[PDB]
């Protein structure tokens, strides 16, 4: 054991730094039962979107002797709210890792983050874009048993330079309430011996955490039917009152009815308006489909037996149907990864009734396999639950139960990425989506973790966009039940870290020649029109270029310091790029679906530069944002006033680890009950915000315990678990919320 901070000297140490937080020392009751001194941390996290502490020693700590060690903290929350801490650990080289956990109120516990050894020793597949551990899980189960709680892996470098640890930071970010905790006994402990079965036998035959019994866990087929039967008894298909046919408000004003979902401002607040003229507000869940419900098993087939992707396809591999596997494929089954295969206590044989829930993926964003067999436990359970009278009948059953669930829960919509077989449900509105993919030219932003950005000035981008919109139009059949269309998702436009980050598309593209790069030519044209002469450009940018043609050879603007004049041109360049994306996209959607709302490209918190946002404001009927935070702080969202566009949250969630999962997700609660409470706080901030016309939750079901095929997300982010059994705390929170969306929003 190596003690760093026990606070028994009664000082707030001068090498801890606090931001929008108050520190003091207090007596409290320690884990062991004795009164100890502790650091009480009162974060002003309601008023400020970033709060916490950072310990920064005089000199970086040298911990290089600790080749198998964890950093421990004792922590508890005080007051009314659980706390999600982010832990950021910085070495002397500017490498940092980020872990996170929930800190409940009540019982104090010990928390640990690995500095070295065990599942860090070989960390991933070698690939920079891999956030997962080498297991293909975003965060693994513990590598030893203890009552202590492992800080959950999020992102960053796994193996820091232990000779120089420069900063340890604990922060509360974008909270809706003030958070207060007590911290004690910050220390280093050598890791105990590694449990070499830690990745062995994780999953039981139902897809659940096999080594943990937890409240609500399924133990036999009979418990699965009894849970099914209690629910099928409660589901009648009656919506909350008094909804109109399209889930709009009966009891409000009645507006113009165009026969399509559209936008209008009511009482100073943006709303949707349903096809019959009633005020509408969108609530619901994303990923109402099976595509993301399979997990890599570790087996592969002969390539000759697997159908290849067509270059024409509008659907990227992550969003494809589950691939039915043929016998000829299955008969060539071989072990590509021992680590994956050993995780499962049960996979079926080819003749077994549940053998149709195998999948094959021909690519993956990340994880230790680039391709391979997968299995959908969720899908298997649908068949366990509902049987298969004719092939795939449990699918029709599921869809019909899903629609009943959504109406019972008071939701007004089926959210993004709803399977298209629900597009004629004709009982609840839905959101449609498409992706523009293909072999058009590309540009780099410096952080394209999911592929290079589109060259939107290349005519082949338009061709592909047109095709994308054609396929959506064919899917939705001009339906009034379609609220509107999302195109794409969190495109990597530019990050807000730095100028080099935000302006990466302009900067990188300026560096290339104009020849063969349509986006470069467009930038060239704009710059030519603003400046006309190479001298005027030379003066603006502080350059010595001999001509426009030298300039068109490509210019390295990386070392130039960003003056105001330079920033205006970066901005103007980013703006024209985004304008062109949104023009092409809007154009295609409008050509095919003249009547439907175009809903944007779903801006993540890490990819909404104001230039791109303002571009979306021009062309999209509704600006969509993804926002994985406790809620919508006023200060982070004040910019909306200047746009005055109706807006929508495409994604958000909160998860916990009390129901078998090893990763709560992006935002963490202390329990199933706390999740539901944290859901209400988020939604409340949506509801109070006069620019938002809806918010969707990501997603319907938990991701597979051993992580989704695509990228290893293994999150407790469902309204239902892998057995298709709903989280009642989530259900109840959604009923409370969905009960007041109209009355509160439009009310007195
Ligand atoms: O001028 C701002 C910079 O000052 C540098 O001296 C400092 O190293 C750098 O800090 C870092 O910021 C992010 C990029 O790499 C990591 C490092 O801690 C961090 O993730 C920056 O603050
Ligand atoms: O490592 C990439 C990650 O960066 C962080 C961000 O909040 C995540 O959303 C993810 O994009
Ligand atoms: O905002 C979060 C979500 O989780 C993965 C991606 O980046 C981070 C995004 O989908
Ligand atoms: Ca103490
Ligand atoms: Ca997937
Ligand atoms: Ca079957």
- Spatial distance between the Cα atoms of 42 and 528, rounded to a whole number of angstroms: 55
Nearest ligand to the C-alpha atom of residue 73: 4
- Spatial distance between the Cα atoms of 634 and 640, rounded to a whole number of angstroms: 10
E strand or H helix that includes residue 155: strand 152-156
Residue 131 Cβ < 6 Å to ligand 2: yes
State the CB neighbour count (10 A cutoff) for residue 23. Answer: 15
Quick one: how far is CA 737 from the chain centroid? 22
Which residues, in sequence order, are bridge partners of residue 152?
100
CA of 627 relative to ligand 3 center, distance in Å: 9
State the CB neighbour count (10 A cutoff) for residue 526. Answer: 14
Residue closest by Cα to atom 6 of ligand 1: 94
The candidate with the shortest Cα–Cα distance to 65, out of 162, 204, 201, is 162
356 labeled part of a ligand binding site: yes
The candidate with the shortest Cα–Cα distance to 93, out of 164, 178, 183, is 164
Residue closest by Cα to atom 11 of ligand 2: 606
241 touches 705 (CB < 8 A): no
- Spatial distance between the Cα atoms of 406 and 422, rounded to a whole number of angstroms: 13
Q: Where are the beta strands (DSSP E) in 174-235?
A: 179-190
The candidate with the shortest Cα–Cα distance to 83, out of 203, 214, 174, 219, is 174
- Spatial distance between the Cα atoms of 461 and 439, rounded to a whole number of angstroms: 8
- Spatial distance between the Cα atoms of 748 and 744, rounded to a whole number of angstroms: 8
CA angle (546, 552, 557) in 5-degree steps: 80
213 labeled part of a ligand binding site: no
Atom of ligand 2 nearest to the CA of 490: 11
Atom of ligand 3 nearest to the CA of 489: 10
35 touches 84 (CB < 8 A): no
Crossing angle of helices 564-592 and 459-476, in 10° steps, is: 40
98 touches 155 (CB < 8 A): yes
The candidate with the shortest Cα–Cα distance to 101, out of 152, 163, 166, is 152
Q: Which of 87, 94, 97, 501 to mutate to test the pocket of ligand 1 (most atoms within 8 A of CB)?
A: 94
Reported as half-sphere exposure (CB side, CA atoms, 13 A), residue 472 has a value of 34
Reported as half-sphere exposure (CB side, CA atoms, 13 A), residue 167 has a value of 18
Please identify which residue in the block is written with the tokens 């001298």.
535
Atom of ligand 1 nearest to the CA of 88: 20
Which residues lie closer than 8 Å to 234 by C-beta, 6 or more apart?
Answer: 408
Q: Name the H helices within 114-209.
A: none
Protein residues near ligand 6, an ion, with CB under 5 A: 353, 356, 388
278 touches 741 (CB < 8 A): no
Residue 639 Cβ < 6 Å to ligand 2: no
- Please state the domain extents for the chain: 2-198, 200-745
Q: How is residue 656 written in tokens?
A: 């916990």
25 touches 10 (CB < 8 A): yes
Q: Which of 628, 652, 697 to mutate to test the pocket of ligand 3 (most atoms within 8 A of CB)?
A: 628
Which residues, in sequence order, are bridge partners of residue 181?
41, 77
CA of 626 relative to ligand 3 center, distance in Å: 9
State the CB neighbour count (10 A cutoff) for residue 282. Answer: 26
318 touches 292 (CB < 8 A): yes
Reported as half-sphere exposure (CB side, CA atoms, 13 A), residue 647 has a value of 28
CA of 674 relative to ligand 2 center, distance in Å: 24
Q: Name the H helices within 365-392.
A: 377-386
515 labeled part of a ligand binding site: no
388 labeled part of a ligand binding site: yes
Q: Name the H helices within 542-671.
A: 548-551, 564-592, 610-619, 640-643
Q: How is residue 681 written in tokens?
A: 């706080």
DSSP notation for 273-324: E-TTS-EE-EEEES-BSSTT--EE-SEE--GGGSPPPPTT-SS-GGGSPP-P
> Which sign, positive or negative, has the C-alpha torsion 193, 199, 203, 209?
positive
The candidate with the shortest Cα–Cα distance to 714, out of 674, 655, 643, is 655
Ramachandran angles phi, psi of 87, nearest 5°: -105, 115
Number of H helices, E strands in the chain: 16, 29
- Spatial distance between the Cα atoms of 599 and 623, rounded to a whole number of angstroms: 6
Please identify which residue in the block is written with the tokens 């890490």.
606
Nearest ligand to the C-alpha atom of residue 709: 5
CA of 348 relative to ligand 2 center, distance in Å: 36
Q: How is residue 208 written in tokens?
A: 């659940």
DSSP notation for 475-527: HHTT-TTEEEEEE-S------SS-HHHHTHHHHHHHTS-STT-HHHHHHHHHH
Q: Provide CATH code, domain 200-745.
A: 3.20.20.80
Please identify which residue in the block is written with the tokens 């004040």.
638
Which residues lie closer than 8 Å to 264 by C-beta, 6 or more apart?
Answer: 255, 270, 271, 273
- Spatial distance between the Cα atoms of 605 and 621, rounded to a whole number of angstroms: 20
Nearest ligand to the C-alpha atom of residue 40: 4
State the CB neighbour count (10 A cutoff) for residue 747. Answer: 9
65 touches 167 (CB < 8 A): no
Q: How is residue 554 written in tokens?
A: 């490509």
Which residues lie closer than 8 Å to 620 by C-beta, 6 or more apart?
Answer: 582, 586, 598, 599, 600, 645
86 touches 173 (CB < 8 A): yes
Ramachandran angles phi, psi of 243, nearest 5°: -90, 145
Resolution in angstroms comes to 2.3
- Spatial distance between the Cα atoms of 481 and 259, rounded to a whole number of angstroms: 9
The candidate with the shortest Cα–Cα distance to 297, out of 382, 223, 238, 372, is 372
Which residues, in sequence order, are bridge partners of residue 300?
334
Which residues lie closer than 8 Å to 108 by C-beta, 6 or more apart?
Answer: 28, 29, 30, 31, 74, 75, 76, 182, 184
CA of 426 relative to ligand 5 center, distance in Å: 28
8 labeled part of a ligand binding site: yes
* DSSP structural state of residue 229: H
344 touches 398 (CB < 8 A): no
184 labeled part of a ligand binding site: yes
657 touches 716 (CB < 8 A): yes
CA of 575 relative to ligand 4 center, distance in Å: 54
Cis peptide leading into 699, omega within 30 of 0?
Answer: yes
Reported as half-sphere exposure (CB side, CA atoms, 13 A), residue 710 has a value of 15
Nearest ligand to the C-alpha atom of residue 365: 5
State the CB neighbour count (10 A cutoff) for residue 346. Answer: 16
- Spatial distance between the Cα atoms of 637 and 633, rounded to a whole number of angstroms: 6
In three state form, how does the secondary structure of 518-541 look? Answer: HHHHHHHHHHHHHHCCHHHHHHHH
In this structure, are strands 179-190 and 165-173 parallel, antiparallel, or unpaired?
Answer: unpaired
The candidate with the shortest Cα–Cα distance to 25, out of 4, 36, 39, is 39
Q: Measuring from each residue's beta carbon to the nearest atom of ligand 1, which residues come in under 6 Å?
A: 90, 94, 96
Atom of ligand 3 nearest to the CA of 626: 1
674 touches 719 (CB < 8 A): no
Nearest ligand to the C-alpha atom of residue 11: 4
- Spatial distance between the Cα atoms of 710 and 647, rounded to a whole number of angstroms: 29
E strand or H helix that includes residue 170: strand 165-173
- Spatial distance between the Cα atoms of 191 and 114, rounded to a whole number of angstroms: 8
> Which sign, positive or negative, has the C-alpha torsion 543, 547, 549, 550?
negative
Nearest ligand to the C-alpha atom of residue 384: 6
484 touches 458 (CB < 8 A): no
- Spatial distance between the Cα atoms of 687 and 649, rounded to a whole number of angstroms: 11
745 touches 695 (CB < 8 A): no
Residue closest by Cα to atom 5 of ligand 2: 155
CA angle (603, 605, 606) in 5-degree steps: 95
* 200-745 shares the fold of 2-198: no
Q: Measuring from each residue's beta carbon to the nearest atom of ligand 3, which residues come in under 6 Å?
A: 490, 604, 628, 666
Quick one: how far is CA 696 from the chain centroid? 12
Protein residues near ligand 5, an ion, with CB under 5 A: 292, 708-710
Residue closest by Cα to atom 9 of ligand 2: 606
Q: How is residue 248 written in tokens?
A: 């709009």
- Spatial distance between the Cα atoms of 337 and 622, rounded to a whole number of angstroms: 45
> Which sign, positive or negative, has the C-alpha torsion 52, 58, 60, 63?
negative
Q: How is residue 533 written in tokens?
A: 């002469």
* DSSP structural state of residue 119: G
CATH superfamily of domain region 2-198 = Galactose-binding lectin (2.60.120.430)
Nearest ligand to the C-alpha atom of residue 448: 2
Q: How is residue 33 written in tokens?
A: 């039962």
SS3 (DSSP) at 1: coil
678 touches 667 (CB < 8 A): yes
353 labeled part of a ligand binding site: yes
CA angle (188, 189, 194) in 5-degree steps: 140
Atom of ligand 1 nearest to the CA of 95: 16
Q: Which of 666, 703, 712, 714 to mutate to test the pocket of ligand 3 (most atoms within 8 A of CB)?
A: 666
Tell me which long-range contacts 584-589 makes (C-beta under 8 A, separation of at least 24).
Answer: 584/456, 584/461, 584/462, 584/465, 585/436, 585/465, 585/487, 585/488, 585/619, 586/619, 586/620, 587/462, 587/465, 588/462, 588/465, 588/466, 588/468, 588/469, 588/470, 589/469, 589/472, 589/485, 589/487
The candidate with the shortest Cα–Cα distance to 466, out of 481, 444, 452, 487, is 487
- Spatial distance between the Cα atoms of 411 and 175, rounded to a whole number of angstroms: 25
Q: Which of 495, 626, 665, 717 to mutate to test the pocket of ligand 3 (most atoms within 8 A of CB)?
A: 626
- Exposed (0-12), middle (13-18) or buried (19+): which is 631, by Cβ within 10 Å? buried
Which residues lie closer than 8 Å to 711 by C-beta, 6 or more apart?
Answer: 131, 132, 138, 364, 365, 366, 367
275 touches 480 (CB < 8 A): yes
The candidate with the shortest Cα–Cα distance to 481, out of 543, 528, 423, 555, is 423
CA of 746 relative to ligand 1 center, distance in Å: 46
Which residues lie closer than 8 Å to 529 by C-beta, 6 or more apart?
Answer: none
State the CB neighbour count (10 A cutoff) for residue 197. Answer: 11
Which residues, in sequence order, are bridge partners of residue 279?
273
Which residues, in sequence order, are bridge partners of residue 375?
295, 358
63 touches 115 (CB < 8 A): yes
The candidate with the shortest Cα–Cα distance to 418, out of 650, 70, 204, 220, is 650
Q: What experiment produced this structure?
A: X-ray
Q: Name the H helices within 143-220.
A: none
* DSSP structural state of residue 357: G
Which residues, in sequence order, are bridge partners of residue 262?
273
Q: How is residue 179 written in tokens?
A: 């958070």
Q: How is residue 261 written in tokens?
A: 């979902």
CA angle (125, 128, 130) in 5-degree steps: 55
- Spatial distance between the Cα atoms of 413 and 212, rounded to a whole number of angstroms: 35
489 touches 602 (CB < 8 A): yes
CA angle (105, 110, 112) in 5-degree steps: 120
Q: How is residue 591 written in tokens?
A: 């050509």
45 touches 15 (CB < 8 A): no
- Spatial distance between the Cα atoms of 641 and 482, rounded to a whole number of angstroms: 28
Please identify which residue in the block is written with the tokens 């619901």.
284
Q: How is residue 422 written in tokens?
A: 């629900």
> Which sign, positive or negative, has the C-alpha torsion 586, 590, 591, 596?
positive
Residue 214 Cβ < 6 Å to ligand 2: no
- Spatial distance between the Cα atoms of 414 and 44, rounded to a whole number of angstroms: 37
Residue closest by Cα to atom 4 of ligand 1: 94
């Amino acid at each position: 054991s190596h003690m760093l901070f026990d606070f028994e000297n009664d000082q707030v140490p001068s090498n801890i730094h606090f931001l929008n937080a108050r520190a003091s020392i207090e007596t409290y009751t320690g884990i062991n039962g004795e009164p100890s001194k502790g650091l009480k941390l009162a974060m002003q996290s309601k008023q400020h979107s970033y709060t916490g502490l950072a310990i920064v020693p005089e000199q970086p700590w040298d911990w290089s002797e600790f080749t198998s060690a964890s950093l421990y903290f004792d922590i508890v929350s005080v007051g009314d709210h659980s706390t999600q801490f982010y832990l950021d650990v910085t070495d002397q080289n500017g490498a940092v890792f980020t872990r996170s956990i929930d800190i409940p109120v009540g019982k104090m516990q010990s928390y640990y983050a690995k500095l070295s050894g065990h599942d860090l020793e070989v960390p991933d597949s070698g690939d920079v874009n891999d956030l997962n551990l080498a297991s293909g899980l975003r965060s693994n189960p513990p590598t030893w048993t203890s009552d202590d709680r492992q800080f959950v892996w999020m992102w960053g470098v796994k193996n820091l330079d232990l000779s120089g640890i420069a900063k340890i930071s604990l922060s509360v970010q974008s909270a809706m309430h003030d958070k207060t905790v007590i911290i004690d006994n910050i220390r280093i402990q050598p890791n105990p011996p590694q449990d070499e079965n830690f990745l062995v036998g994780l999953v039981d035959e139902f897809g659940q955490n096999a080594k943990v019994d937890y409240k609500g866990k399924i133990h036999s087929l009979e418990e699965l039917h009894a849970a099914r039967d209690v629910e099928l008894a409660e589901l009648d298909g009656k919506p909350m009152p008094s909804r109109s046919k399209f889930g709009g408000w009966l009891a409000g004003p009645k507006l113009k009815a165009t026969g399509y979902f559209r936008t209008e401002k009511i009482n100073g607040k943006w709303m949707l308006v349903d096809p019959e003229g009633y005020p509408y507000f969108a609530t619901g869940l994303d990923i109402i489909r099976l595509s993301n419900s399979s997990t890599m098993t570790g087996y592969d087939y002969d390539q000759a037996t697997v159908a290849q992707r067509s270059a024409d396809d509008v659907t990227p591999e992550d969003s494809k149907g589950l691939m039915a596997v043929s016998e000829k494929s299955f008969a060539t089954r071989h072990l590509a990864s021992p680590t994956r295969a050993a995780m499962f206590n049960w996979l079926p044989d080819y003749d077994h009734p549940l053998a149709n829930h195998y999948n094959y993926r021909r690519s993956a964003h990340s994880g230790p396999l680039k391709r391979g067999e997968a299995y959908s436990f969720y899908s298997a359970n649908l068949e366990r639950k509902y049987g298969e009278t004719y092939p795939g009948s449990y699918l029709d059953k599921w869809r019909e139960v899903t629609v009943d669930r959504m109406l019972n829960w008071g939701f007004t919509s089926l959210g993004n990425w709803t399977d298209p077989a629900y597009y004629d449900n004709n009982r609840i509105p839905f959101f449609a989506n498409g992706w523009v993919i293909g072999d058009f030219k590309t540009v780099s932003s410096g952080a394209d973790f999911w592929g290079a950005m589109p060259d939107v000035f290349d005519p082949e981008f338009k061709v592909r966009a047109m095709e994308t919109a054609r396929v959506v139009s064919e899917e939705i059949k001009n339906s009034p039940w379609c609220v509107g269309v999302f195109i794409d998702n969190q495109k990597s436009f530019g990050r807000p870290d730095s100028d080099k980050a935000q302006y990466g598309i302009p900067i990188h593209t300026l560096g290339r020649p104009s020849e063969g790069v349509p986006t470069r030519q467009a930038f060239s044209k704009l710059l030519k029109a603003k400046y006309k002469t190479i001298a005027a450009l030379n003066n603006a940018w502080g350059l010595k270029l001999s001509s426009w043609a030298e300039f068109d050879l490509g210019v390295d603007v990386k070392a130039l310091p960003v003056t105001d004049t330079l920033r205006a041109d970066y901005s103007m360049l980013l703006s024209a790029y985004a304008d062109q994306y949104f023009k092409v996209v809007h154009g295609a959607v409008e050509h095919y679906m003249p009547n439907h709302l175009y809903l944007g490209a779903r801006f993540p918190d890490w990819g909404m530069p104001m230039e791109v946002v303002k571009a979306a404001a021009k062309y999209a009927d509704v600006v969509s944002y993804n926002s994985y935070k406790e809620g919508l702080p006023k200060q982070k969202w004040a910019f909306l006033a200047e746009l005055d566009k109706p807006s929508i949250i495409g994604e958000f969630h909160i998860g916990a680890m009390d129901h078998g999962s090893y990763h709560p997700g992006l935002i963490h609660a202390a329990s199933q009950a706390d999740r539901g409470e944290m859901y209400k706080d988020y939604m409340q901030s949506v509801i109070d915000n006069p620019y938002f016309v809806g918010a969707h939750w990501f997603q319907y079901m938990d991701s597979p315990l051993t992580g989704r095929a695509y990228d290893g997300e293994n999150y407790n982010v469902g309204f239902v678990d892998v057995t298709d059994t709903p989280y009642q705390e989530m259900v109840d929170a959604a009923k409370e919320v969905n009960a007041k969306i109209y009355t509160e929003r439009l009310g007195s």
